Write an enzyme that holds these catalytic residues in place. Structure first.
Site, short mmCIF file in Angstrom:
data_model
loop_
_atom_site.label_atom_id
_atom_site.label_comp_id
_atom_site.label_asym_id
_atom_site.label_seq_id
_atom_site.Cartn_x
_atom_site.Cartn_y
_atom_site.Cartn_z
N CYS A 1 15.47 17.08 -2.20
CA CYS A 1 16.10 18.45 -2.16
C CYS A 1 17.28 18.39 -0.91
CB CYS A 1 15.06 19.56 -1.88
SG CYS A 1 14.32 20.27 -3.09
N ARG B 1 20.49 13.65 -3.52
CA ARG B 1 19.16 14.47 -3.14
C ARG B 1 18.39 15.29 -4.30
NH1 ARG B 1 16.98 15.49 2.06
NH2 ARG B 1 17.68 13.48 3.15
N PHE C 1 15.17 19.09 -5.85
CA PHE C 1 14.64 18.04 -6.69
C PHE C 1 13.31 18.45 -6.98
CE2 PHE C 1 12.68 14.55 -8.36
CZ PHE C 1 13.31 13.18 -7.84
N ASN D 1 13.68 23.00 2.08
CA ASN D 1 13.57 21.43 1.82
C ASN D 1 12.19 21.16 2.45
OD1 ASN D 1 14.94 18.06 2.72
ND2 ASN D 1 13.66 18.83 1.17
N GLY D 2 11.16 20.73 1.44
CA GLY D 2 9.94 20.46 1.93
C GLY D 2 8.95 20.71 0.98
N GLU E 1 0.61 -6.97 2.66
CA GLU E 1 1.53 -6.12 3.43
C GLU E 1 1.53 -7.03 4.96
OE1 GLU E 1 -1.80 -2.80 3.70
OE2 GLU E 1 -0.12 -2.04 5.10
N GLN F 1 -3.73 2.46 -1.10
CA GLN F 1 -4.74 1.67 -1.61
C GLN F 1 -6.23 2.54 -1.88
OE1 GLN F 1 -5.27 -1.07 2.17
NE2 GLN F 1 -6.77 -1.42 0.51
N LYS G 1 -8.78 3.39 0.91
CA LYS G 1 -8.44 4.50 2.12
C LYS G 1 -7.04 5.14 1.96
CE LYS G 1 -6.67 0.50 4.62
NZ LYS G 1 -7.59 -0.56 4.67
N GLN H 1 -5.11 -2.03 7.83
CA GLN H 1 -5.86 -1.79 9.20
C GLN H 1 -6.18 -3.52 9.29
OE1 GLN H 1 -10.24 0.00 9.64
NE2 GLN H 1 -8.60 1.44 8.76
N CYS I 1 -15.41 -16.11 -2.83
CA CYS I 1 -16.18 -15.16 -2.25
C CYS I 1 -17.54 -14.86 -2.90
CB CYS I 1 -15.20 -13.75 -2.37
SG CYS I 1 -16.03 -12.30 -1.96
N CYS J 1 -15.89 -8.95 5.76
CA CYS J 1 -14.52 -9.21 5.51
C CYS J 1 -13.82 -8.60 6.94
CB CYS J 1 -13.74 -8.62 4.48
SG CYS J 1 -14.68 -8.69 3.03
N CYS K 1 -16.42 -14.29 7.60
CA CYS K 1 -16.46 -14.69 6.20
C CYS K 1 -17.25 -16.02 6.33
CB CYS K 1 -15.28 -14.73 5.55
SG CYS K 1 -15.50 -14.95 3.79
C1 FMN Z 1 -9.37 -8.43 1.11
C2 FMN Z 1 -8.54 -7.23 0.46
C3 FMN Z 1 -7.18 -6.96 1.01
C4 FMN Z 1 -6.34 -6.11 0.58
N1 FMN Z 1 -5.31 -5.72 1.19
C5 FMN Z 1 -4.18 -4.92 0.50
C6 FMN Z 1 -3.00 -4.93 1.29
O1 FMN Z 1 -2.80 -5.66 1.92
N2 FMN Z 1 -2.00 -4.29 0.52
C7 FMN Z 1 -2.26 -3.37 -0.66
O2 FMN Z 1 -1.47 -2.64 -1.33
N3 FMN Z 1 -3.80 -3.31 -1.23
C8 FMN Z 1 -4.68 -4.17 -0.48
N4 FMN Z 1 -6.26 -4.39 -0.96
C9 FMN Z 1 -6.12 -3.50 -2.33
C10 FMN Z 1 -5.81 -4.45 -3.37
O3 FMN Z 1 -4.50 -4.82 -3.37
C11 FMN Z 1 -6.26 -3.93 -4.79
O4 FMN Z 1 -5.36 -2.72 -4.86
C12 FMN Z 1 -7.70 -3.53 -5.16
O5 FMN Z 1 -8.42 -4.61 -4.59
C13 FMN Z 1 -8.11 -3.68 -6.55
O6 FMN Z 1 -9.31 -3.24 -6.66
P1 FMN Z 1 -10.66 -4.30 -6.83
O7 FMN Z 1 -10.68 -5.16 -5.54
O8 FMN Z 1 -11.74 -3.81 -7.26
O9 FMN Z 1 -10.02 -5.45 -7.78
C14 FMN Z 1 -6.85 -5.42 -0.61
C15 FMN Z 1 -7.68 -5.59 -1.16
C16 FMN Z 1 -8.83 -6.56 -0.48
C17 FMN Z 1 -10.14 -6.81 -1.37
C1 ONL Z 2 12.86 18.93 -3.07
C2 ONL Z 2 12.04 20.02 -2.23
O1 ONL Z 2 12.06 19.99 -0.84
C3 ONL Z 2 11.40 20.83 -3.11
C4 ONL Z 2 11.20 22.28 -2.65
C5 ONL Z 2 10.11 23.32 -3.17
N1 ONL Z 2 8.77 22.70 -2.82
C6 ONL Z 2 10.26 23.29 -4.66
O2 ONL Z 2 11.31 23.78 -5.10
O3 ONL Z 2 9.21 22.98 -5.65
O1 AKG Z 3 -3.52 -6.61 6.96
C1 AKG Z 3 -3.22 -5.45 7.06
O2 AKG Z 3 -2.29 -5.36 7.81
C2 AKG Z 3 -4.07 -4.58 6.14
C3 AKG Z 3 -4.80 -5.13 4.95
C4 AKG Z 3 -5.65 -3.86 4.64
O3 AKG Z 3 -5.28 -2.81 4.81
C5 AKG Z 3 -6.97 -4.11 3.70
O4 AKG Z 3 -7.68 -5.25 4.09
O5 AKG Z 3 -7.56 -3.07 2.89
S1 F3S Z 4 -17.99 -13.47 0.98
FE1 F3S Z 4 -16.42 -12.23 0.14
S2 F3S Z 4 -17.04 -10.03 0.81
FE2 F3S Z 4 -15.43 -10.55 2.34
S3 F3S Z 4 -16.70 -11.61 4.09
FE3 F3S Z 4 -16.25 -13.17 2.71
S4 F3S Z 4 -14.57 -12.65 1.33
#
Ligand code: FMN
Ligand code: ONL
Ligand code: AKG
Ligand code: F3S
EC number: 1.4.7.1
Length: 1485
Positions: free
Chosen positions: A1, A31, A207, A227-228, A881, A947, A950, A956, A1115, A1121, A1126
């Site tokens: 928006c 926008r 939008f 806008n929000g 990441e 992801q 979390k 993290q 693993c 982890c 590990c």
């Molecule tokens: C060791 C570990 C690190 C991961 N770090 C990332 C991260 O860097 N970026 C991300 O988008 N997802 C991260 N995740 C999520 C994975 O990319 C993926 O979405 C997820 O592991 C798929 O589910 P599954 O572990 O059951 O196969 C990671 C997963 C694990 C196991």
């Molecule tokens: C684009 C925008 O900020 C949407 C405003 C409001 N939530 C809506 O019109 O749906």
């Molecule tokens: O390396 C990082 O900064 C994050 C990777 C991560 O969030 C994860 O292990 O789920």
């Molecule tokens: S055994 Fe697998 S569970 Fe993590 S700590 Fe090592 S990658």
């Protein structure tokens, strides 16, 4: 928006202003969004003064005397198309006007040209007319509009899309519709008519997350444009609706107030609601400004800027007991017809830029360069900071600034006085150290009866008590959904937290804590519309967790207070009706605090009793108080044994509790502490006294709530309190509608009788030690886990020899019901074909993705081996990441005969064609090693929103794991924990995501952009937005997925199954005609060709694997982890452990073959030849004929089976190879032969261009072409690119060495986002009528993720300047809030005032701040950085040399003056120094 306003304070109203408003609207087109026809707009409109010269013709045509300025009311009405329905509506509008005792003059047909509309907007179009009205008694101005408001509301009880009053006012009118910007004035002929004149215009381009246009939903609404996104809407609506029966204000009758009734409605948009609730506040005595100060209050606490305005603190202090924020990102633009103004949400998550001329002409809007005014006339360029407002008084012809506006409102009433006399404050620092129970077995038995489990105390409570924080863990939630378990679970576990993604952001609970509060108010919620001392007679809690001392003080307090029992001797069902009735009657008797205790009269649970689980109790009383119209009379305290985890507290407040006394949990801590085993361990080296364990336990809870509110972007617990920020899985409809009304629950679980059966299982166990279930870690007694050490082992063996894949497959098949897909089975419609007819393994494997696991969480052995494996297969790996080592971009040359390469010596099992280049490069909120060369090295680019482990949170990586190597890749400091921010600081709404995707398509036009979401209710809608935003691919992650470190509570309670997610997205896309825009990809616990097929049938086209892939490469599921330990070298950075990693790419190549060969055999059974034939074929699914649940009769899987027929129509599988950005300025720069020469011959070239705000990401396509040829640092040439005007978003994003970009004008947000090298220079027009240092010249989040380069700007910046800077260098002349927010290196110089929360999370690098006022120490986040005067000569010379270069590039009068009086000003600088730079020569000597 996009949103804005223009005001002409001094002159006659003119057409020129209206033209400018149409043109600014034109400038916001990018926008906005469009319907499925690609033609109709999601919305645009304009609010202006009543156009007196235009309606003077209408009176002249009727031979009728025109009423004077404030006596003519005009309703802009949307009427039905059907001839007879239209006359019914017209008559009814005439009828309610007559009954309001006003006079109807007649109707004006609105001149329109429908031939310009898109086909969807043309088919939906209402019939548009204006009604003209006057008062026969003499009514005018305030009283008229007040009667018009009463009348418009009445008409509005018959609200339809066909029948809607846009505006009913004697001062304002709203022209809006389902149109693109430049169609608004082509459709509304009046807007192009030179007789249309106005001293102001509020404008909006919408939008929307949908395809189906509804004319009323365009904006502005009646008073305001928005806008929000409101992120607490259900709560905000429930509270407001409760107030409606009992409205009361002097100089209003009851009847007049009842005419307004439907004030709030869960079926209107969040904006329609906010507008309507806001106009209630205006028409009953407040200016729109004051009303917005109540609904969307500033973050006033510990605001140093408020030192001198204690009446303003008092104002919010009072109202925060009366009205919770309508929270989330918000720029509000509003007009009375008297005042026209704007205000920002408490955290300022939308931009607002303004401009003032010599004649007090003012333009405000989302973007800066949008009305062209002669620059010589501009006398101020400013911005709104978080929570700020600016207004115009049209009669007085004055610009009102933030503090005046606010002081004028605060000082109306002695709010402080009232609080001081009326408020009781209940806080105790000290606990009760003395126990509740005396003997041993008593606490055990009670814990068993209330559902505590051995892992609950050992793994949740104990770490919280002992360490002062909720536990960190790792890997995904591996166990059955609560409803599928045969293991006993609490009602809480049926509830999944919701969280922000795309359409609004999470906030940072740690870096931006100062903006959040856990404060609550006990008692009678007072009269909102009429301020009184009485409304302030309340009990304020500093926190929702009340200890034993605090509860007694509450019970002793100044309010009436009633114990109500949740125990009973009879069936829960009826036990709960007597409960609800006893609450109703108790409040109706005069009680102001209800204490739902499951320990009434002090007494304990015996075997002859049961309880109503506290979530059910409070859900029930809250909603029945509401249904009885009694919820404003009383607050709910839950006094319960069954509350201990961070999630538990959140569900409670969320479903109606103001406060909780977790008495058994406090006792569990007391008895954990007392106890010779624990004492033995604190004496020999596990860590603490008892008041501390108690204090730690409360600290954990409070930190855990900050976290949870922040996943949704909510600041105040008071807002979270109503709202029901949850999805329920496994709760049947009667129950949800009974205690949890409005929660989605898609799969039909438990009845009330079933929840009793579950409390009775625990009762059976209670009537030695608590029982340990296998919940967190695998046990042989325990709950099922899909990744068990033995499943791993046998898979590791099967892969090791090119049968062992049997045990692994059977360990997976002898599983109990775990995931939703397990309730499903195939039902084929073809006969089965031969396996030879099915598409080859090589063809299936092209759809598999390895999933983005950061280089820090994994070892470079684990991480590189997967890339090689996946590249061999013809598939994709994902550098998560943590960035990526450049060494990996090149194909391997030097593999010897044993399969080792000196380029990658730590790897084994290599052959010559290999590459460890990740095909997918990830962009995540940390932007760690996000480089133009990194970006050019991808085949695909993925923007990670969340992801599964979390969702509300950022990545993290613990400091133990940040080696020198990881620090080099991320451009950060070696020993230092990296908690990435939860939002992209780049993405606070859907239109910001569109801009990021634009920037990616800009740097790398051949790369697909994917957007990674997590499954939750609302992902359908969000994904429609993402497609409209031009993404190529959408990933859907299930609650399921692994991680190298997450909160345990996040792993177990945030996010939904991907089955619900894929399905919801696939359907919404298809039914909106967006499905061919994107390829859908899925992940989360996928292991098996079977899993693959389930995903396919539900609508996934590609398949992601994380944990399973780590298992293939060695693993086990040791699940440490997050620990750096590990044992097998996969998820650690210790060298001696990395050395354990055996693991070759072939092993994982093998694994993906077993998967694909299983795909083939499932395709054989079904009688189709390729996944292409089955994707989305949901009618091929059925409900498993042999399953039997422990907890309910069964679920209901309609939402997984009822997808749109896909047998015949399959065109949605054809995708464009890459979406274009369209014609872009950079293309003309690259087609220039002098430029092509400069790149090819590394020579010098120079070009100059005029820019406008639609020119976005300029420079960046040229960086990408350079880096493509030379990487980040090979280019030896020099290109200068000079611009004039107002730059759009992302000017100079991803700049390289050899690029000099010069801008004479101003820039919008994200200047030099990901800058890597070269120089950006930004100066005002030399003509300028202002002191450059006092005026904004660039926007928010400049140098985001910057990894190099120099930026010089002769003006002020917005918020989050140098947000996550790694190696950027900059000199600016002022900034807003959060300067240097997650900075890890580089140097930032700021020669003027700066907002609050400086250096939050700043861990490396140095900043210099010129402070002439003296109050910078007030504005520092003190958690990491220290401030000192400059004493190190090297620091002096770092500063001088940077200021000297600012001056050379810029001419900055402020820099010159500084250099000219060098010693005078030196002592006025503060240097910000993180404890990592402390011994650097620039900080020390
Ligand atoms: C060791 C570990 C690190 C991961 N770090 C990332 C991260 O860097 N970026 C991300 O988008 N997802 C991260 N995740 C999520 C994975 O990319 C993926 O979405 C997820 O592991 C798929 O589910 P599954 O572990 O059951 O196969 C990671 C997963 C694990 C196991
Ligand atoms: C684009 C925008 O900020 C949407 C405003 C409001 N939530 C809506 O019109 O749906
Ligand atoms: O390396 C990082 O900064 C994050 C990777 C991560 O969030 C994860 O292990 O789920
Ligand atoms: S055994 Fe697998 S569970 Fe993590 S700590 Fe090592 S990658």
């Amino acid at each position: 928006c996009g949103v804005g306003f223009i005001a002409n304070l001094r002159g006659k109203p003119d057409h020129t202003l209206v033209e400018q408003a149409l043109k600014a609207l034109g400038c916001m087109e990018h926008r906005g969004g469009c319907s499925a026809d690609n033609d109709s707009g999601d919305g645009a409109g304009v609010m202006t003064a009543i156009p007196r010269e235009l309606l003077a013709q209408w009176f002249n045509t009727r031979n009728l005397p025109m009423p004077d300025g404030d006596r003519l009311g005009v309703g802009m009405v949307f009427l039905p198309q059907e001839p007879s329905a239209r006359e019914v509506a017209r008559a009814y509008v005439e009828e309610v006007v007559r009954l309001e005792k006003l006079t109807v003059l007649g109707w004006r047909e609105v001149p329109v040209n429908s031939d310009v509309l898109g086909i969807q907007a043309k088919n939906n179009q209402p019939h548009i007319e204006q009604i003209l009205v006057t008062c026969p008694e003499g009514c005018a101005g305030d009283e008229l509009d007040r009667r018009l408001y009463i009348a418009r509301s009445i008409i509005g009880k018959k609200l339809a899309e066909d029948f809607y009053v846009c505006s009913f006012s004697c001062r304002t009118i709203v022209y809006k519709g389902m149109v693109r910007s430049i169609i608004l004035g082509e459709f509304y002929l009046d807007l192009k008519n030179p007789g249309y004149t106005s001293n102001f215009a509020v404008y909006h381009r919408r939008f929307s997350t949908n395809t189906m246009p509804k004319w009323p939903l365009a904006q502005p609404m009646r008073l305001l444009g928005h806008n929000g996104e409101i992120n607490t809407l259900l709560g905000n609506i429930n509270w407001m609706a409760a107030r409606e029966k009992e409205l009361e204000v002097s100089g209003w009758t009851k009847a007049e107030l009842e005419a307004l009734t439907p004030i709030v409605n869960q079926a209107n948009s969040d904006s329609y609601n906010l507008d309507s609730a806001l106009e209630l506040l205006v028409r009953t005595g407040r200016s729109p400004l004051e009303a917005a100060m109540i609904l969307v209050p500033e973050a006033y606490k510990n605001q140093p800027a408020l030192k001198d305005y204690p009446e303003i603190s008092d104002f919010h202090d009072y109202y925060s007991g009366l009205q919770e924020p309508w929270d989330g990102p918000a720029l509000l633009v509003f007009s009375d017809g008297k005042i026209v103004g704007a205000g920002l949400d408490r955290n300022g998550l939308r931009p607002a830029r303004y401009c003032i001329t010599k004649d007090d002409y003012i333009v405000l809007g989302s973007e800066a360069g949008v009305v062209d005014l002669p620059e010589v006339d501009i006398v101020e360029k400013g911005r709104l900071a978080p929570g700020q407002m600016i207004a115009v008084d049209l009669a007085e012809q004055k610009i009102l600034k933030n503090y005046q506006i606010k002081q004028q409102a605060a000082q109306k009433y002695p709010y402080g006085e009232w609080i001081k006399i009326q408020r009781q404050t209940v806080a105790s620092d000290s606990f009760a150290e003395k126990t509740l129970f005396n003997d041993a077995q008593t606490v055990l038995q009670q814990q068993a009866a209330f559902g505590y489990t051995a892992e609950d105390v050992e793994m949740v409570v104990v770490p919280m008590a002992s360490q002062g924080k909720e536990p960190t863990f790792c890997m995904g939630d591996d166990t059955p959904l609560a409803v599928l378990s045969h293991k006993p679970r609490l009602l809480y576990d049926y509830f999944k937290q919701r969280f922000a993604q795309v359409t609004n952001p999470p906030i940072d609970p740690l870096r931006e804590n100062l903006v959040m509060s856990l404060a609550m108010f006990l008692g009678k919620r007072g009269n909102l519309l009429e301020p009184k001392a009485e409304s302030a007679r309340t009990i304020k809690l500093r926190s929702p967790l009340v200890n034993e001392v605090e509860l007694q003080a509450i019970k002793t307090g100044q309010l009436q207070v009633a114990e109500v029992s949740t125990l009973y001797d009879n069936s829960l069902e009826d036990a709960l009706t007597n409960l609800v009735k006893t609450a109703i009657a108790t409040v109706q008797a005069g009680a102001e605090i209800l204490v739902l205790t499951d320990r009434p009269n002090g007494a304990i649970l015996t075997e002859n009793q049961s309880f109503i689980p506290p979530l059910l109790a409070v859900g029930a009383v809250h909603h029945h108080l509401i249904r009885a119209g009694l919820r404003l009379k009383a607050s709910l305290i839950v006094d319960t044994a069954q509350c201990w985890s961070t999630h538990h507290f959140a569900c409670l407040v969320g479903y109606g509790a103001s406060a909780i006394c977790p008495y058994l949990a406090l006792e569990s801590v007391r008895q954990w502490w007392l106890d010779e085993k624990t004492q033995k361990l604190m004496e020999n080296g596990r860590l603490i006294d008892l008041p501390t364990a108690l204090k730690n336990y409360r600290q954990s809870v409070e930190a855990g709530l900050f976290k949870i509110l922040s996943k949704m972007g909510i600041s105040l617990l008071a807002s979270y309190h109503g709202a029901q920020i949850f999805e329920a899985i496994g709760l049947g409809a009667e129950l949800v509608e009974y205690a949890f009304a409005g929660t989605t629950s898609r799969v039909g679980g438990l009845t009330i009788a079933d929840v009793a059966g579950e409390v009775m299982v625990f009762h059976g166990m209670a009537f030695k030690k608590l029982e340990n279930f296998g919940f967190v870690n695998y046990r042989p007694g325990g709950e099922y886990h899909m990744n068990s050490p033995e499943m791993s082992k046998s898979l590791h063996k099967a892969v090791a020899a090119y049968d062992h894949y049997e045990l692994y497959r059977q360990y997976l098949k002898d599983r109990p019901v775990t995931a939703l897909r397990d309730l499903l089975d195939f039902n084929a419609d073809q006969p089965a074909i031969s396996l030879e007819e099915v598409e080859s393994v090589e063809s299936i494997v092209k759809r598999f993705c390895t999933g983005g696991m950061s280089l820090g969480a994994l070892s470079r052995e684990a991480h590189e081996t997967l890339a090689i494996a996946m590249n061999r297969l013809g598939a994709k790996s994902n550098s998560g990441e943590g960035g990526e080592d450049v060494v990996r971009y090149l194909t391997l040359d030097d593999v010897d005969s044993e399969g080792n390469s000196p380029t990658l010596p730590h790897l084994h099992g290599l052959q010559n064609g290999d590459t460890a280049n990740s095909a997918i490069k990830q962009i995540a909120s940390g932007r760690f090693g996000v480089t133009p060369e990194y970006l050019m090295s991808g085949k695909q680019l993925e923007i990670k929103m969340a992801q599964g482990a979390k969702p509300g949170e950022g990545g993290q990586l613990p400091g133990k794991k940040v080696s020198e190597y990881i620090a080099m890749l991320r451009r950060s400091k070696p020993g230092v924990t990296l908690i990435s921010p939860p939002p992209h600081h780049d993405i606070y709404s859907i239109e910001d995501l569109a801009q990021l995707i634009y920037d990616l398509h800009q740097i790398n036009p051949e790369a697909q952009v994917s957007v990674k979401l997590v499954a939750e209710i609302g992902i359908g809608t969000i994904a429609a937005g993402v497609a409209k935003a031009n993404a190529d691919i959408i990933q859907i992650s299930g609650h399921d997925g692994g991680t190298g470190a997450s909160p345990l509570s996040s792993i177990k309670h945030a996010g939904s199954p991907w089955e619900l997610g894929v399905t919801e997205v696939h359907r919404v896309l298809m039914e909106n005609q967006l499905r061919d825009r994107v390829l859908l990809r899925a992940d989360g616990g996928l292991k098996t060709g079977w899993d693959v097929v389930m995903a396919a049938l539900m609508g996934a086209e590609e398949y992601g694997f994380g944990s399973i892939a780590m298992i293939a490469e060695g693993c086990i599921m040791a699940r440490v982890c997050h620990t750096n330990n590990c044992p097998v070298g996969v998820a650690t950075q210790q060298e001696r452990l990395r050395q354990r990693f055996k693991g070759v790419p072939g092993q994982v190549v093998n694994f993906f073959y077993f998967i694909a060969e299983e795909v083939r055999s499932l395709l054989a059974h079904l009688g189709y030849r390729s996944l292409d034939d089955i994707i989305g074929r949901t009618d091929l699914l059925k409900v498993r004929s042999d399953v039997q649940l422990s907890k309910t009769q069964n679920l209901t899987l309609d939402c997984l089976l009822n997808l749109p027929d896909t047998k015949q129509n399959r065109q949605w599988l054809n995708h464009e190879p890459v979406h274009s950005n369209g014609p872009v300025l950079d293309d003309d720069i690259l087609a220039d032969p002098d430029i092509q020469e400069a790149i090819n011959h590394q020579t010098t070239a120079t070009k100059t261009y005029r820019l406008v705000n639609t020119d976005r990401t300029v420079g960046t396509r040229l960086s990408g072409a350079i880096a493509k040829k030379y990487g980040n640092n090979g280019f030896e040439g020099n290109i200068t690119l000079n611009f004039q005007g107002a730059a759009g978003q992302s000017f100079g994003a991803f700049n390289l060495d050899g690029m000099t970009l010069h801008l004479q004008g101003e820039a919008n947000d994200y200047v030099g986002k990901g800058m890597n090298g070269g120089e950006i220079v930004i100066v005002p027009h030399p003509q300028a009528s202002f002191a450059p240092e006092d005026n904004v010249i660039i926007g928010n989040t400049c140098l985001y993720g910057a990894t190099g380069g120099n930026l010089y700007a002769n003006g002020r910046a917005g918020e989050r300047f140098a947000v996550r800077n790694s190696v950027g260098k900059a000199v600016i002349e002022g900034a807003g809030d959060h300067c240097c927010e997650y900075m890890t290196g580089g140097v930032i110089v700021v020669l003027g005032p700066v907002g609050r929360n400086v250096g939050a999370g700043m861990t490396g690098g140095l900043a210099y701040f010129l402070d002439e006022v003296g109050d910078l120490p007030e504005k520092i986040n003190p958690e990491i950085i220290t401030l000192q005067r400059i004493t190190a000569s090297k620091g002096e010379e770092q500063l001088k040399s940077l200021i000297t270069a600012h001056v050379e590039h810029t001419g900055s009068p402020k820099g010159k003056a500084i250099l000219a009086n060098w010693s005078d000003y030196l002592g006025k600088f503060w240097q910000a120094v993180p404890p990592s730079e402390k011994d650097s020569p620039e900080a020390n000597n």
